[PDB]
Amino acid sequence: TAPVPLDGTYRIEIQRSKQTYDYTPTPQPPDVNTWWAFRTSCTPTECLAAATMLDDNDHTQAKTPPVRPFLMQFGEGQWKSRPETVQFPQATTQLLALRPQPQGDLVGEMVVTVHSQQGAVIRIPAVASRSGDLPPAVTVPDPAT
């Protein structure tokens, strides 16, 4: 029941054409694809994954300017990033949940909970698919550091 580690180049699609506002559809196309270099380190109790953003066209180089890496923790059968406060056209909490599919890719959603329209939950479906190994040029920060 330990998860498959997230290691290699991953393509994340935030499908904003399926965005919902309290389960009621509010489509905002187009979907947005980004590329990330994932590395995973597991202790006997937890598995953590760190992802550094790659450039949009050249996925062998980190994004310019540098973007801070985000972390995911596997628990309750899913990878979930820690909630982070983000300003919205109001203060929100935004996180990414990715559930491993039997096949190898991951399906989940981006969850944006509003705290200041104060209280709704914006859900955007998300897909993550592995695109080969890591870029040997990029250095992904080990989450066990």
| Technique used to solve these coordinates | X-ray
Distance between CA atoms of 46 and 27, rounded to whole angstroms? Answer: 36
Resolution for the entry shown, Å: 2.2
Domains and CATH numbers, the chain: 8-130 (2.40.128)
Distance between CA atoms of 143 and 64, rounded to whole angstroms? Answer: 21
Tokens read off for 81: 């990033």
Distance between CA atoms of 85 and 95, rounded to whole angstroms? Answer: 9
Cis bond leading into 141, ω under 30°?
no
Tokens read off for 72: 């995911």
Tokens read off for 67: 């973007």
